[PDB]
Design a binder for this molecule. Structure first.
Ligand SMILES: NCC(=O)NC1(c2ccccc2)CCC1
Ligand SMILES: NCC(=O)NC1(c2ccccc2)CCC1
Lengths: 300, 237
């Protein structure tokens, strides 16, 4: 179990760690988060009390280094940094634990929610979507646009998700126009899975990361990517059975976790109605259809 | 974006454009079977592809053999239309290719866009106008060449005959849409109006009669009367 200490908390902020959150008051003696489960990526995120504009945060994996948070009064945000002195860090952490100035990652033993939301998400893949090679962790905020959003403006601050476009030469084989547009299997299986992602685990990892950035930061571009990756599978007549079953599980846990009060903007009516009721895979997502119908029958 | 009443003069500017109407591509007669079920029989159809400035009509005849053994024919017809329009564009020299293609039915947008991906600079546009191009098969010479076709065939006509020698494209298009609107509204009456006077003939190389300017004003007034009549008849006014 690992620890992310905080130098201090000089401004009032709501701090999230994965699906958990807690309020810290201005200059409250908060010094970080302990008992973070090893084996998963994690995200530590921030919303300032005085300007809810810009939610922002950091994706990290404690197996890759010792990380801490320190507020920067010039740039006005909580920044993640890596401590390279291992003894300095263990000493800092031990002292804050002795003074009980840390919150405990509050994981119920029965609870597999975070695993289920991050099953295919790997730090190495995050670091290729979010390019900042000098750090081992990755910054994401509400405003960051995607490569695809940019094509339609600072490249270094972009989310480099895989571009999916159903009306593109990449998606449509010359001579198979109607076939490829109405059945996206060749774009899914040959172009994306075999060609770009290499396997379905990497595809699902990007899908899960897009969802989490949409939910945690209200990143509109991440929201578009998540729905595009769902639509591409649902609009394919030929999908491996293991992928459909796994997709059903992935989406079930995403819909379960989504705040009820955010569904109106995080759920695209067209995509979900098409996917659950019109697409080739309308009958292959039993768990997802059941939770959607009981939780969000309005959207549908 | 969409072509409507506001931007109507744009049709007659110097940017090459084509209207595509797919109404008459997939045509059937519905009938009873020996067992008392219903079946369809396809008949030959056509794509109506028109340059509104010049009157050039690329009439691609769709022979019933196209449909043999195919499913979901009304969906296929839109894609076959888009395939044939793309093929026409590719067959034209670069300086003759359109800068815009306006589809008369919005369901043609995605099929045509997908077929034209190789032409990113050709705009594919819908229209808010309710154009009467379905009535093209009420023009006797067009209907005759479609029904007689034994194989796929493209036939080239100017739909304005020689009108552009005397009138502008705007006026020619207005006359064409009036004639077609009338033929769509009441084909029998419209054709009576056009042929009542046996001394006015259709040249071998024309589609419409050889009216003088004065006779065209009369004819056009008669077509308006017909359209208003049929309106009152149908609507009781
Ligand atoms: N740039 C932030 C942003 O666009 N936020 C909104 C959003 C909608 C849908 C999905 C994610 C975010 C909230 C209004 C738009
Ligand atoms: N505008 C008639 C004309 O000058 N040429 C024709 C035409 C060309 C191309 C498309 C449609 C018609 C008449 C048949 C050849």
């Amino acid at each position: 179990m690992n620890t992310v200490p905080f130098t201090s908390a000089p401004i009032e902020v709501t701090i999230g760690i994965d699906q958990y959150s807690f309020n810290v008051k201005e200059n409250q003696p908060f010094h970080g988060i302990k008992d973070i489960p090893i084996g998963h990526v994690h995200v530590i995120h921030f919303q300032h009390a005085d300007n809810s504009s810009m939610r922002y945060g950091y994706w990290f994996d404690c197996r890759m280094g010792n990380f801490y948070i320190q507020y920067d009064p010039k740039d006005g945000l909580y920044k993640m940094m890596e401590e390279r002195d291992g003894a300095k860090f263990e000493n800092i952490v031990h002292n804050f634990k002795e003074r009980q100035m840390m919150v405990s990652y509050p994981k119920i033993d029965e609870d597999d929610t975070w695993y289920n939301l991050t099953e295919f998400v790997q730090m190495d893949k995050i670091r290729k979507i979010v390019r900042k090679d000098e750090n081992q962790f990755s910054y994401v905020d509400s405003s960051m646009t995607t490569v695809q959003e940019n094509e339609l403006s600072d490249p270094a601050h972009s989310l480099n998700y895989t571009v999916i476009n159903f009306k593109s030469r990449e998606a449509i084989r010359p001579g198979h126009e109607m076939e490829d547009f109405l059945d996206k299997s060749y774009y899914l299986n040959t172009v994306m899975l075999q060609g770009i992602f290499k396997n379905s685990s990497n595809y699902f990892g990007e899908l899960q990361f897009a969802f989490l950035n949409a939910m945690f930061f209200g990143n509109y571009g991440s929201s578009l990517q998540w729905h595009a990756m769902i639509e591409l599978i649902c609009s394919s007549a030929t999908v491996p059975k293991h992928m459909l079953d796994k997709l059903d599980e992935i989406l079930y846990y995403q819909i379960k976790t989504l705040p009820e009060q955010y569904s109106d903007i995080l759920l695209n009516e067209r995509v979900w109605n098409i996917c659950l009721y019109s697409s080739f895979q309308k009958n292959s997502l039993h768990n997802t259809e059941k939770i959607m119908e009981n939780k969000y029958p309005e959207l549908l | 974006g969409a072509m409507n009443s506001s931007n109507y003069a744009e049709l007659f500017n110097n940017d090459i454009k084509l209207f595509v109407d797919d109404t008459n591509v997939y045509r059937v007669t519905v009938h009873k079977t020996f067992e008392g079920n219903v079946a369809t029989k396809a008949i030959n159809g056509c794509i109506f592809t028109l340059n509104p400035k010049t009157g050039h009509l690329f009439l691609k005849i769709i022979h019933t053999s196209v449909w043999a053994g195919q499913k979901r024919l009304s969906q296929l017809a839109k894609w076959k239309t888009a395939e044939e329009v793309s093929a026409l564009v590719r067959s034209l020299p670069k300086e003759e290719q359109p800068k815009q293609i306006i589809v008369t039915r919005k369901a043609m947008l995605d099929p045509l866009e997908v077929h034209m991906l190789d032409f990113p600079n050709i705009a594919i546009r819908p229209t808010e106008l309710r154009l009467p191009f379905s009535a093209a098969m009420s023009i006797d010479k067009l209907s005759d060449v479609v029904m007689k076709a034994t194989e796929p065939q493209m036939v080239l006509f100017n739909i304005y005959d020689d009108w552009l020698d005397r009138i502008s494209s705007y006026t020619a298009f207005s006359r064409l849409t009036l004639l077609l609107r009338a033929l769509k509204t009441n084909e029998e009456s419209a054709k009576m109006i056009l042929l009542s006077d046996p001394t006015i003939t259709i040249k071998s190389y024309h589609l419409w009669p050889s009216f003088t300017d004065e006779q065209w004003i009369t004819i056009e007034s008669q077509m308006r009367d017909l359209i208003l009549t049929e309106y009152g008849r149908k609507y009781n006014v």
